Amino acid sequence: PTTNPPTARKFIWTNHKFNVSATPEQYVPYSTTRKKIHEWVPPSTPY
Amino acid sequence: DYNTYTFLDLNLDLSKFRLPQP
């Protein structure tokens, strides 16, 4: 890498990390899609 | 020498001759 450095693209990380699995930095999978069926919230004003 | 309306106006003049419409 010293001889021919790599291409820098102004998003690539500068601090790369090792396995963070046992440490609390670990990926915890989650759905990234937003809600699908929005619901009718009752009316808060007493009828 | 002819005017911009020569064709149209001449035609209108011919309208009288023009045989009846379908």
């Binding site: 999978p29 989650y30 759905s31 | -």
Partner: protein, 80 residues
């Protein structure tokens, strides 16, 4: 506009629960016979499969496009 997928009869089991999965949000199904669609060449044979396997059936008659008369001349009709 292709009609090669409107040729063979298919019998499809009734659709069932597809609840969202809490961890990843993937669709989850508890019905085994959901994705199964068997293809049968003729209405008579498909009805037979339902009877011997004991599944209830409700056959829908094939509906094919009715003949339609077309002729390029018409579009240039004196009075349409």
């Amino acid at each position: 506009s292709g009609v090669n997928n409107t040729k063979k009869w298919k019998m499809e089991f009734d659709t069932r629960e597809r609840w969202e999965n809490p961890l990843m949000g993937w669709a989850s199904t508890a019905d085994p016979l959901s994705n199964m669609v068997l293809t049968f060449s003729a209405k008579e044979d498909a009805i037979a499969f339902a009877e011997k396997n004991g599944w209830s059936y409700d056959v829908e008659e094939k509906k094919v496009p009715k003949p339609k008369s077309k002729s390029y001349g018409a579009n240039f009709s004196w009075n349409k």
